[PDB]
């Protein structure tokens, strides 16, 4: 989890607007002018987009703008163009990182996943394996965050999930897998998999049998 | 305004790499705020060094930081798998003057070979009264990053409804996919199995799964 909280993802059509959040503290954001924004674009160096705040360095258009209330700063992209589709972090200044927002410019229409979540097989029971997988399929933008639950309550290590990749229907399709012991699985109520996608989270709940 | 690093550098398991961001004396011979991020692809960068030399809490030994006229470097010792990533300096000066290198891709080279674990999937319960029956192998823990997958109905091929996700290196530094079959609930209970044949290395797996009783 991220020293600063960013939403996962953010998407609009050419000419639309976007505006991102980056939350911390009043020991970060809410005390010093100090909140910068980058674009990257994968693969490449990270650009400084806003320093100080609200700051432009020379080359970076009005259309982008950056604001803070409170705890809270914004990075606003006015006029979404083609180039502006990439990863943009946040961070405070020691120096705090939020954990990146996608923002697609939309390439197709947009899609909701489709989440189904698989509870351990025989086979890999035998073989003292409880490996939970949550396929995610059908969906646009390629941008999901995966949480998974134990009980009432977040779990945290086991969740390992795949990079997007655009399969044949031109969506992209991912897997979250937690490799569970067969105790921990025999051992609790049920177990979760959340999917978020475009702001709206599905939930998917399995429990052992017999 | 950048800062010039290699493109690419690499070094064996167990040995070091030293990597380099050349700036002029207005950056990095300028003040002694020279950082250093390690960042794996499509995740956040982690700051491995600030102020030329200092590791913040958490980060290994291994990683220490130098400065020698307008040219930093950083050496990374006993390379291990989880050190390959791309590596980015910057030098701060106050003002608009946060400067960036364009990047150093470091690869750990003669990382071992390694088969799938292979896991097929009969459909869910939810998914069976939603009216669908989709199957899941996981393929996970496998290197090289290059898997062919085949489906089998009964004994007979499948040729269509079958999907494969591109191979992706997880937090184990090795790299998972799934292949899923889309079949109705009439696929899938008219047919005695299900089979998925993974092909790695030119090596063959198969796991079979039944409709349940
Ligand atoms: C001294 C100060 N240092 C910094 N460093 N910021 C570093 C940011 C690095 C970054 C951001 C987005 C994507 C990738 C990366 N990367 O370098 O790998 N920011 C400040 O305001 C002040």
């Known amino acids: 989890?991220?020293?600063?909280?960013?939403?996962?993802?953010?998407?609009?059509?050419?000419?639309?607007?976007?505006?991102?959040?980056?939350?911390?503290?009043?020991?970060?954001?809410?005390?010093?002018?100090?909140?910068?924004?980058?674009?990257?674009?994968?693969?490449?160096?990270?650009?400084?987009?806003?320093?100080?705040?609200?700051?432009?360095?020379?080359?970076?258009?009005?259309?982008?703008?950056?604001?803070?209330?409170?705890?809270?700063?914004?990075?606003?992209?006015?006029?979404?163009?083609?180039?502006?589709?990439?990863?943009?972090?946040?961070?405070?200044?020691?120096?705090?990182?939020?954990?990146?927002?996608?923002?697609?410019?939309?390439?197709?229409?947009?899609?909701?996943?489709?989440?189904?979540?698989?509870?351990?097989?025989?086979?890999?029971?035998?073989?003292?394996?409880?490996?939970?997988?949550?396929?995610?399929?059908?969906?646009?933008?390629?941008?999901?965050?995966?949480?998974?639950?134990?009980?009432?309550?977040?779990?945290?290590?086991?969740?390992?999930?795949?990079?997007?990749?655009?399969?044949?229907?031109?969506?992209?399709?991912?897997?979250?897998?937690?490799?569970?012991?067969?105790?921990?699985?025999?051992?609790?109520?049920?177990?979760?998999?959340?999917?978020?996608?475009?702001?709206?989270?599905?939930?998917?709940?399995?429990?052992?049998?017999? | 305004?950048?800062?010039?690093?290699?493109?690419?550098?690499?070094?064996?398991?167990?040995?070091?790499?030293?990597?380099?961001?050349?700036?002029?004396?207005?950056?990095?011979?300028?003040?002694?705020?020279?950082?250093?991020?390690?960042?794996?692809?499509?995740?956040?960068?982690?700051?491995?060094?600030?102020?030329?030399?200092?590791?913040?809490?958490?980060?290994?030994?291994?990683?220490?930081?130098?400065?020698?006229?307008?040219?930093?470097?950083?050496?990374?010792?006993?390379?291990?798998?989880?050190?390959?990533?791309?590596?980015?300096?910057?030098?701060?000066?106050?003002?608009?003057?946060?400067?960036?290198?364009?990047?150093?891709?470091?690869?750990?080279?003669?990382?071992?070979?390694?088969?799938?674990?292979?896991?097929?999937?009969?459909?869910?319960?939810?998914?069976?009264?939603?009216?669908?029956?989709?199957?899941?192998?996981?393929?996970?823990?496998?290197?090289?990053?290059?898997?062919?997958?085949?489906?089998?109905?009964?004994?007979?091929?499948?040729?269509?409804?079958?999907?494969?996700?591109?191979?992706?290196?997880?937090?184990?530094?090795?790299?998972?996919?799934?292949?899923?079959?889309?079949?109705?609930?009439?696929?899938?209970?008219?047919?005695?199995?299900?089979?998925?044949?993974?092909?790695?290395?030119?090596?063959?797996?198969?796991?079979?799964?039944?409709?349940?009783?």
């Open positions: 910057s030098s701060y000066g106050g003002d608009n003057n946060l400067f």
């Open positions: 004396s207005s950056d990095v011979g300028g003040s002694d705020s």
């Open positions: 100080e705040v609200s």
């Open positions: 961070s405070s200044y020691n120096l705090f």
